[model samples]
Target: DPNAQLTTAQLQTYGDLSMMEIYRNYHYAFTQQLMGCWNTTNYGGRHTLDNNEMSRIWTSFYTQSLKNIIDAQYRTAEDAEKVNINSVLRIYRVYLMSIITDTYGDAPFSEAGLGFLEGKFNPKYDKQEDIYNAFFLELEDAVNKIDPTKDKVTGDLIYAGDVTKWQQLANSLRLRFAMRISSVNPTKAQTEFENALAANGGVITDASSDALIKYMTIAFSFGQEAYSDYRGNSLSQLLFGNDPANNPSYLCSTFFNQLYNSGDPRTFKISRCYYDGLMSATSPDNRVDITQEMIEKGIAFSPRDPGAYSWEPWPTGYDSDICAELAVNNPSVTATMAREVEPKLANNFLKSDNPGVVMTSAEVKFLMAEATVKKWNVGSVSAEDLYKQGVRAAIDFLTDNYGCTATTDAEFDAFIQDKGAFGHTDNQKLEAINTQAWILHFTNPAECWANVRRSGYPKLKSPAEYGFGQYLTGGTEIPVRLCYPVLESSYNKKSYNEAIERMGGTDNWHSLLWWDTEN
Candidate 1:
């Protein structure tokens, strides 16, 4: 009965809801969401990357989604819901597990989803290579079982009971997983990627199949606004407020000088100077007018400017903490000295309505281009031209939905070729593919970070004198994966230990995932 199925269905829905929310907000809020890592990722705090990305992923998989589906499968063994439930949950499991295994090495896998039936609270962690193989295999099994003609599935958020689209997402997700571990396991990675291509003629072929989740304006959107506000609060603190976190530090000289030299358009998209002439926060001679320092602790914001950071000795009266202090207490600073470089700076990444995207036709095209370039293709499309096509498609998607700013083909091509264009040489295909992939990766940190971890293209270096220390020189060069959480090891020691041994110990983040070796 639908009523009997309600309990299990709700649990699965919650899991999907959480996964979508975490994937969309966490990824996009971190500028890496703009790239695909989701923290204020600089060299200072190498290990301080946000756990929200990792932890929530764990909560989604182990706690709610997959478990419920497995339960439903057994309870309704003779029912029609089994196919739909398994297919949807499997797709989600693949996505969530991927985030876990890719981000943190040796996650709970083999013993997952079998807990309730087996009554085992401590599940064994599976090797990443083995887990990835299982993910691809299970996804294939689910997709094959999904009958588009049948009417099943409850509370489907991605596609409204459309099994074909679910199948597409399953395959697309398979393709993503196949490529994710390619750097470390090309034999298996290539075989799986080619199989995914062969099995499905397309991957997320349409935007409709794009795995986007709708976020609420009031409740779930906190991360996006909070993140932008934090970035905003940091501006001008270096000169006036003296708040340690609130550094009005401009983009590093390396990034600035390079963009200036290249005539890149995104500079304007990112920054604005009320009084030009490049005010350096580190102007040593005190030559450039520096904002006089004062104690502006417990800064309060206003309704008019919800993101404003003003200096105050104590909290006057506002529920919102503003979290950051302006650090100027003695006296009020003038507008000139206190002038903040609003990180509201859209920098071309913020599109109108800010609709969260999953996979796009543009993204699929780029993946195809990369696959073709690597000689693992179901389609014979030119990687370079397809790369260009992907760029135009992204621009077209933006223009069509968000309104056109740079509408001409010439302007678009120029942007693609610009120094702002990063990631061209990894495959000898010009940085265009890499750069385009990076741009399209916005707000999708999972995918974006995956690419960065895999390709090492767009070779990004952190600030020299960062808070945490120089991670690059620390022999932590380009961490391939995150260490498994301590709690997992403590609670589920046996499984965790076995998985670690299988996939190289957790101490090293530089260890590659199964598909990452290709570069």
Candidate 2:
């Protein structure tokens, strides 16, 4: 069955698997900074404002993921019995195209990934506005068309052919997109949000209904090509593959401040770094955890020193500061450069088998929280109730799925108590809800960054503000949108320039996309 020649079901599987744009998402998350900014993300080559992030997203969607999804849908449509299969792929395309248009202002939606069929060399890019309108129509039709009695949706990677789950994913996405446009189009936003809530099976209301892509740690013989293509969690491979010992990015003090201040249990698990005796390539789960007392004393660890103890976390400006000396300090006595002192991510995060989460109950609950804040009719849930529920869901999702440092009932109860309720003012309440969203969005950087752009909460400190990067080439601020890929000028110059012209004569980092209404 795995090697069946050109089976429509296999094609659908291939399409689902292609969402693993592991190669490109590395830069995408790096650009978003996960929960922390990279220490070396200055305005140099492969730096923050660089083209690596700018170009890869465009290339991956057009050349791979989006292209494959489009083909999968076309083949399945030819089979009358494949109704569910056909519609699920249709729902997926909306999510895909959204990533395309959301990152870049306007893109080739209608003719996208059509190079093979129509011999279309350079397709005309569509406006984000037009593309969003189409997304609504597509999601509505896709959800309504799913007939449970019709056919089994084989190779359905995300939902495993659960028609209700597929319907839920569609509506949740509808709710997500509806809220994204809420600031720009309030009336339509309200209507869609309410409709999505009331949709046949409803949006993701619980963790069991969460949409995720569980990755394989090892290759499957005679399996779909997806197995061969998957290396690890795309981002995980990039971060831990080279050196699971040291963290790739310095834990952002800003992010750390939130967890540390709240006495969040996840901090002990994430920042609790150790050396060879504690760390192992083959068995990461056996890592020895650093103690609270040890962390309180600011202990630094080293392989060289038998009894040495000195540890301090480095932040963005670390590159130009004591970083140089600490790295160079004797027989590596400093252990300063070593992850023991520097502290890598938790071993759980280092694991290659981590799943790629598409959407979660936490994100849905937060959306509803924000929805209630905006006075939208979202049933009996109040803004305060949804906000607290969202926080609990976020934390629980991490522990359940990723083996993240979990809380004892008392600890979680205290954390919830400390979190308290949203303030009365709209600005205060929305900020509270979204800032909490950032804490758990550590795994989903692109979405986190989009929310950052859409709603300015948990305001981040840029590299320049960290006391270094004063002479950086790019502007001293987080980018609003990644610029169009440079190759477009040579290959698709006319259309590229048109997009450039539409964005006020330049394609730079600060060009706000359609839904990003911030001034």
Candidate 3:
């Protein structure tokens, strides 16, 4: 009876519920996190996008990734195979902790994640550097123990009785962590990454292996769709809606103008123009950058064009280039910046396959790309070639069923070759890599936000429309980390205070985690 305390269905439900919790927690906060690291979310009303917002985002991340997963393990450990269940929990823990520590610098590591029983809710905060080191260690151990061949588990959401994917995930995670903390401990990162690539048959290299949990397009009311609603309504619709999100985050002049001037086919995929057929670069340009004057005139999202002075695109373009006026105009254009298109509803998370992404080939490629960039050898893998392959894979996945807007390989190669065509400093390179990362991430902005934070290559800027006014003040660096939440002080006060002491001060977002110190 004790062994059967929880049924597979029940355990699965609990695990899913916990995942939903993580999903909900990350839904909006990570958008802010993206801004902090990539500077995408906070650009509008630059004043609102600050260190404090980063703190709130980090706090929510911890609660979602750590606390919830811990609960899942507690509830389902006995019912399911212990090792497999624990492995799953560990994977999620590593993912979430990376985001938190990466953003906030020193945070609770050793004393976190024990919230199910014994009322030990408030654990001591661990140092960010130490936490990162420990995380890699945990990942190493997880990779070592993972034996997909064992084959004893139930209610598997990510792989569906496929522990090999889980193993790949563990090792992929190890590579990711190794890359992140490499700045802190290069030798250690090298050794671990080498081991990870060797152990897990190499990292995720294909879309099929992508830890994509396809959602159900039918059930548009809940889970990913519910989240989809939250996202579209808040970010896409609300931001663009009249009285749109007051945050006023918009495409910066650099990005907006580049895409606008280049007549990048993706402009329609990004922001809609104020008028129909207005996005053409040579003709009447549709898109507009938020200027000081636009800041004076607030945007209202109610009717498509709010704060008519500010730039906005047509709604349909948000999803693809098919809607772009340039789709017809730039038919033979020699552009490399193939826009990041949304995946089809049937093939991706729109199906009821699974909720959260466990592991994917995309993660593996990015990990490999970083290792190559750092000259680290992971399983004799070609760093640059792997990066090229990864970029191509990302584009192919997005446009698989959507549409083949890239008329020629030469145009597509432009992104791979031209620096200014895609962006200024090999902007196309970044657009290719980061935008794929963004689209591939889909429901999981956590990974996108983290990478954006570290690289800062995309150079997302603040718009003049909303409260975030200008670049984050006092600290020139985009807010690197967030502060502990106010609630944590009262509820998890002791642990929160300890974390603050290790972290120095929670107020400054410019601080770096142990891994990002080099940057």
Candidate 4:
């Protein structure tokens, strides 16, 4: 079956496997929490070790899904009949490969998944810088070769067999990766970013054109099972209470304060007031009879009012004793919408019918806004105008998708004026754009993590504050990249050691990837 000619069912399987349960759940749960979009109650010492986090990402999605896609691509003969299919596969390939390199720094790229192509099972690890360069060329080639006149590919879960859309995605992804490498290699990043814009297929500037994997509610769909299996993180519990006044975690003051201070309407949609409904609940000590009225008259608590709502630092480990104590002691603390109120809030919006988001128009606009801020000759559009466009697009995306209508033009204008203004300095504008990008990427963790690492915006705290300081390398150093998967050291030790040597002779979490030039 693996070597046979690819069929419609097989192609569908490729898309299905790409959004595998492990990848979806881990990134939605652990990755986002660690990166600060959500909060966690566990994972203090667990995440840093050779846990399922690193292994699952490597084996589940990258090794299996990516390999299958490559096999499917190779089986399809290079002709007009296969152009559309090939294009789709190539785009997915690039996207998947990028995730791997971004996480591990150097990985087997050129010779990866070649066990079927050749007899070689031990593919050599490629340099991060070299891998990125190859990605650009391969993506550029894939986008250029896509012919809209060709028959559309079937089993397309993303754009519904839209070859043109896939072509656009190719270029948009090129733009994203280009921007990703901006700091390390400004010249290449700039050139690729511009070339992607100039590409005939164009980029994702319209939210409608966002690359989303539409999950069905049927048995064959990943969403149906993934949503049911994934229990929400502590942030989810705090925001909406796992049960009535029975929450075990508190919100992060850092993330909540930003939404609070900005007066952004997304806060209304994403968060809710934590109310104790005069309910009896179990506590750390014993079964406590808690009777209390609503602390805040309003539906949402204000960060400015310390008595109303507050948050704890990122959870270093899984134990919720500290967070639970805070929640029981301070009934005024607010939380995000919980699974009970909105199940969509759980697993970072991985609903049964949720779409697997890839690129968004708002992100493209933000990228342009950043380019403009840098005076990189993107277009005649002013940086401020692009910035406002990005903000509006982001707000509109939330309103259209998640029913967030807490803000209006005047409110947004005021928020931008007060909080998101294009400041006097270029760094300020970059911060504003990237910070908003971080918020916009709340449901999308992969992009959110990358943006945070690249821009260093929405300044996060060191793990020391969260109680995991001792587990880290410098006791205060935040994690930059994941350690190489344990499987690599076992099965591919020779190649793995070579990659480690290039990675400063250490295979630890503190090892910096090439693009992570910012501290």
Candidate 5:
């Protein structure tokens, strides 16, 4: 493998990561109220474990992301001239591995994606603990190896060969993982956090260094074209499909309240009240802004009349009451379309050109905020300071990257000091910070689910919490972690059984990862 030179196309395909991301995002989106109503006939009709989404995600990453990143390394392992690209390959491998390990506790890492080069068909699944340690080792090596003076990564797709950005991505990712395991391994977490903070290329705390996968600026299309036709923003495609999905993308009431209760300027930017038939509208455009009294009453706005301001809670915590699934079967009819009361996801975020969030400065700031809150050696700036910065950056992230409506400095200032203010106690502060982290990670539902599990902030009331008798497959609690793909048992029985046995012998959704200890 090292004898033959890897083609530019080969490297580009590896960098253009898409399918795995789409599947993972959609899978987790349905798991939570914040991202989805969990009401869709598509993808096994949501709120259940019977779907192919998990396996699709697992298969895509192994075959496409991890395999190519690893195979590319063998081809360019010793070439000094290809150092930057090779280092990027390793860094990306770490990112992909982190996602997999977090999503499904123990997974193949050291030996995974190696069969192409080593003929190891049945790679053993590595424990989450071991895999997390390897992330630090590999990230540090990759970050140190990325030299601006090295070769331009012409084959790269994400960052355009900017080695500084690559270094920032590596270091920022270190902060993310370090903060993630803080509960179970505080000692290791603090050390990694401080080290990454003090590393050569500092973590991504600014938009100039945000890591995003830019999509083409084109009309969102719904077609038979699979993810290989990965040109459109997958969010837009998934949320809207071929036509505007009337009710499927309603915001979770809890998520709406987080924004509305905090007086978050992103409230309207994150959600909207859609009208199927509007004669005329202005100011907030066709959509209605979430008003101060919006949460209490249901109102419908039609431009046709002297329409009163219209608003409502986001279609209850579950749209199952409204027969939202009817839309999945009969695309022509939707429960919310004619009713025009439910708060749907704002169209602002559905742009086909919107960049896929890889990582962002808001995330880095929040991670550092938490580290400093623990009085770790990460920095002198107070946890309160970092929290404010993260909150502001989260707002600015939407404005700058997603083209949302702008907020005034005074508005943001009031927000942080008021509801967004730091908590009085350490636990309270963590709850505040990670709740914001939850909001910032809205587009990134998989990571949001992981953070919620790890941080335990904004404790989402279970489906049973709604007292609707609408329990999910995991019963009272939310699904903790997805089970491994079924095919793994057939072919890689030894390692699969080992992992399943480690997960209490059933591979159940109720299983928790090593770092997912609750407070």
Candidate 6:
């Protein structure tokens, strides 16, 4: 009931679960490539936005958890009594809406989630430009209204009721949105970016203040089901595992070539080489030397030498040469192939205790670096300083959060000097910053894919003209946007058709959003 008073803690929990569901389902780090369950052969149908999985991204946030936030705000009326809690909830509401708006261009915003209170059964879709403007205003309100002197917000999972951190998150998110619209709406973008930097509590500059949701063993453990569905991709196997069973999904040469050539330590930290010890020394046909001893105690795996690793071609078209070789019904090839290419994922990534990353200080620094390069006058700090900090923070995050061995400060300093140093030219520096940002977003696939659209960095290649299989686009080009969910067409035809009409009267992956004007 709208009138029923629920504690702030209860509201926060609901929001947290909803957030986890989004991260769990849509995170492309696992799904973008073929893993155990979602192999390339069986998972082609999901590439389009029309998949049922994409529907969860909408329902999870807007209809379910975001509703809880609106209810909390409506019930907790007085600014004095629930000022901090309301502000936090509003910040979350904005974040959730931003995700929805980014995925599907125009979304129901102004009168959205008021189903119970106002009986809004079918909320009208709002314009993206209008939604972006409203987001900035909402963030501004949230930053100013949060009262540190009043009661700390209960049910806060990310910040643990720290109003100051919440303030920083709100302002940082504002800066993010402002930068997102720089190309289309430069004037508003500049003003909002400046205002966010000038807010009472500045954006998150320290790693300690990162908006991360820590998952513990039993109580706070999240993504358990999501993690089970996820496994190392074929590229992961090529780099580390080399297993033939996982060969159908290959590494994007564009991504791996840079990582390999860069000579970054993280390459080894993320993957391992195929275990050659499984083969018998005397066997001419490369038969496996499996023994009872080997079965009982698993052999310790190590990374392959950088020279030993090879990348598979990026798949495209309807070609099937790669597929033919693997599945050919020949006894000689099948027996040797099964054991030769198996690799293992890094131990820490598979751990249940690993925290789900939301936003990080590294990402914040990258945004600041971009702002500085654009000469937005964000702060006294130079772009070079922020860029270096961003790279270092990414490396440190790998070590601290994901159980990778720590890279020495001296080595990281060298990496900054070599690969990540800011360039004299504007485009060069932008590419450098964006590439580092992309690298840091490996675990956070939604952000990874979004940044690819936003900055166009890393310059990933489309599948070959003659390669095997095809995506929804009928070609090798990466999808720019997801199609509207089928539920909208079935349940709310009027609003759905209106939104599609705005999108050039087509509901396909090729349709572009406002910010996606650039090639």
Ranking by TM-score: 5, 2, 4, 6, 1, 3
Name the weakest run of 10 consecutive residues (lDDT summed) in model 1. 300-309
Give all candidates' CA lDDT scores: 0.49, 0.63, 0.46, 0.60, 0.67, 0.60
The candidate scoring highest on lDDT is 5
For model 1, state the Cα shift of residue 155 in Å: 1.4
Q: Pick the candidate with the highest TM-score.
A: 5
Cα error, candidate 1, residue 386 (Å): 1.1
Better of 5 and 6 by TM-score: 5
Q: For model 6, how big is the CA root-mean-square deviation?
A: 8.9
The residue-by-residue lDDT of candidate 1 on 1-519, one tens digit each, is: 432333333323322433443433233222222111112223212333434444655765566545555555555445564666656666665665676777665666666777658777787767667888888898888778776555476555456556777778777777777766766776777788788766743467645566553332221222334322211211111112122123322232223333335664443333222222232332211122211121133322111011112221111432211212222341222223332322222223322123345467777777767776677755766676677677677666655543435557666668667643435455556345655666566445567767765766555543223222334353434345655556666787777777777755554555676556642
Candidate 5 has its poorest 10 consecutive residues by lDDT at 302-311
Model 1 Cα shift for residue 422 (angstroms): 11
Q: Give me the runs in candidate 6 sitting further than 4 Å from their true place.
A: 1-37, 40-50, 77-79, 218-252, 274-345, 469-474
Candidate 6 lDDT by residue in tens digits, 1-519: 322222322232223433333333333322232122223322222232335655656766665556777777766646576788778777877876777777778888887878878888778889888988888888899889888888566566578789899888999888788878888888888899899999989999889898765444332222445223212121121222223323312222344445546767675565433223333221112223222222244532211111112222221112223333533653233322222232323434534345556678999999999999999988899999999899889988889888798999787777777765777899999999988887788766556767777787766434333243343343345556666778889987888888888867887765667866564
Candidate 2, run of 10 with poorest lDDT: 302-311
TM per candidate comes to 0.68, 0.83, 0.65, 0.78, 0.84, 0.77
Prediction 6 TM-score vs. true:
0.77
RMSD of each: 10.5, 6.7, 10.0, 7.7, 7.1, 8.9
Candidate 1 error regions (>4 Å): 1-46, 49-56, 65-78, 206-208, 219-334, 337-339, 342-356, 397-406, 416-426, 465-478, 503-510
What alpha-carbon RMSD in Å does predicted model 2 have with respect to the real structure? Answer: 6.7
Per-residue lDDT, model 1, residue 271, is 29
- What is the per-residue lDDT of model 5 for residues 457-480, given as tens digits with 9 covering 90 to 100? 767544444443343443545557
Give the clash count for model 2: 4
* lDDT, residue 101, model 5: 83
Which residue segments of model 5 deviate by more than 4 Å? 1-47, 277-338, 470-473
lDDT by residue for model 2 over 352-398, one digit each (tens)? 56766678889999999999988889989788888888888887877
